[PDB]
Amino acid sequence: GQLGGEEWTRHGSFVNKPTRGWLHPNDKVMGPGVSYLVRYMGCVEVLQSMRALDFNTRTQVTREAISLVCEAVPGAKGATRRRKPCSRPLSSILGRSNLKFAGMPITLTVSTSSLNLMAADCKQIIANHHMQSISFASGGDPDTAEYVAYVAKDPVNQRACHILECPEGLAQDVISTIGQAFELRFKQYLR
Numbered sequence: 001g002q003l004g005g006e007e008w009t010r011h012g013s014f015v016n017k018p019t020r021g022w023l024h025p026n027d028k029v030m031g032p033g034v035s036y037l038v039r040y041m042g043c044v045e046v047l048q049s050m051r052a053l054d055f056n057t058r059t060q061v062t063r064e065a066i067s068l069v070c071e072a073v074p075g076a077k078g079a080t081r082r083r084k085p086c087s088r089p090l091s092s093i094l095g096r097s098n099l100k101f102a103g104m105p106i107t108l109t110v111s112t113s114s115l116n117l118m119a120a121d122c123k124q125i126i127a128n129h130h131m132q133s134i135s136f137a138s139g140g141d142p143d144t145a146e147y148v149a150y151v152a153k154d155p156v157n158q159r160a161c162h163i164l165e166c167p168e169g170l171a172q173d174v175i176s177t178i179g180q181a182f183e184l185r186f187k188q189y190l191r
Contacts, residue, residue, distance in 0.1 A: 009031070020179035021112075021179050021180060021181045021182055022034055022110055022112075022173050022179060022180055022181035023172070023173050023178065023179065024178070024179060025179075026112075026181065026182070026183075029110065029111050029112040029181040030111070030112045033109045033110060033111040033116075034109065034110045034111075034170060034173060035107055035108065035109035035110075035118075036107065036108065036166070036169035036170045037105060037106070037107055037108075037120060037166075037169070038105075038106070038107075038108040038164055038165070038166040038169075038170050038171075038174075039076075039103060039104060039105045039106075039164065039165040039166070040101055040102070040104045040105075040106055040108065040117065040162075040163075040164060041066075041069050041073075041076070041102050041103060041104075041162070041163030041164055041165050042069040042072060042073060042097055042098050042099040042100055042101065042102030042103075042162075042163055043069070043097060043098055043100065043152060043160050043161060043162045043163060044062075044065035044066070044068050044069055044094065044096075044097035044098075044149075044160070044161045044162075044163060045094070045095045045096050045097060045098065045159075045160055046061060046065065046093065046094050046095065046158070046159065046160065046161055047092070047093065047094065047095040048061055048091075048092070048093040048094065049158070051091070051092065052091050052092075052093055053089065053090050053091045053093070057089065057091065057093050058138050058139065058140075059089075059138070059140065060088070060089025060090060060091070060093060061089055061093045061094055061161075062138040062140065062143060062144070062149050062161070063088065063089055063144065064086075064088065064089050064093070064094050065094055065097055065149065065161055065163070066078075066079065066143070066144045066147050066149060066163060067079045067080055067086065067144075068094065068096065068097030069097040069098075069099060069102055069163045071083065071084075071085070071097070072097060072098065072099035072102065073099035073102040073103050075103050076102070076103040076165070078144075078145075078146075078147065078165075079144070097163070102163070104119075104121060104122075105120060105121050106118060106119045106120040106121055106122065106126065107119075107120040108164075108170065110133070110170070110173065110181070111133070111181075112181050112183060113132040113133055113181075113183065113184050113188070114132070114133050115128060115133040115134070116128070130152070130153075130154050131152075131153055131154065131156075132184060132188055134150065134151060135151060135153065135184070135186075136151050136158075137149070137150065137151055137174070137176050138151075138161075139175075139176045140175065142175075143175065146165075146167075147163075147165055148163075148164045148165060148166060148171060148174045148175055149161055149162070149163055149164065150162040150163065150164055150174070
């Protein structure tokens with residue numbers, strides 16, 4: 001079945017030009033992939049879209065979001081505990097975050113337009129086939145003292161936002177600062 005393939009890796013490099021991707025180079029993602037022990041934190045259901053703070057709600061939202069996931073699963077203990085709602089951000093943003101698979105320490109791996117996780121505590125591998133992998137993050141400065149958030153398009157057009165927590169290693173890339181695995185600009189499939 002099928003005609004032709006592309007699962008080989010014995011070709012030369014580029015003509016003669018440098019570059020920088022996730023963590024450091026581009027090949028680091030298209031070959032070995034960045035993998036470390038990161039605690040996968042529940043997702044945060046957001047409702048915001050147009051009527052928000054002021055043509056922006058990255059920090060604001062992500063702030064209450066992170067605190068949200070923690071509210072449901074205080075086991076991690078970071079901002080709240082047991083139960084205790086707080087004010088902010090401003091405007092009608094966010095709706096509710098689900099702890100579905102929160103505070104779970106596993107070995108995550110980031111690849112060029114492909115994120116594959118590996119249950120380090122559950123003793124198995126975690127897969128994901130919803131979309132490429134990433135697109136637009138929160139950035140933060142900081143996101144929340146020592147917290148990290150991820151975006152999840154599903155439905156598409158900014159809907160859900162997963163949560164993460166890394167003490168060191170991947171926290172540098174996820175947080176967004178040093179390079180980033182490019183080759184994807186709303187076109188996907190390297191089209």
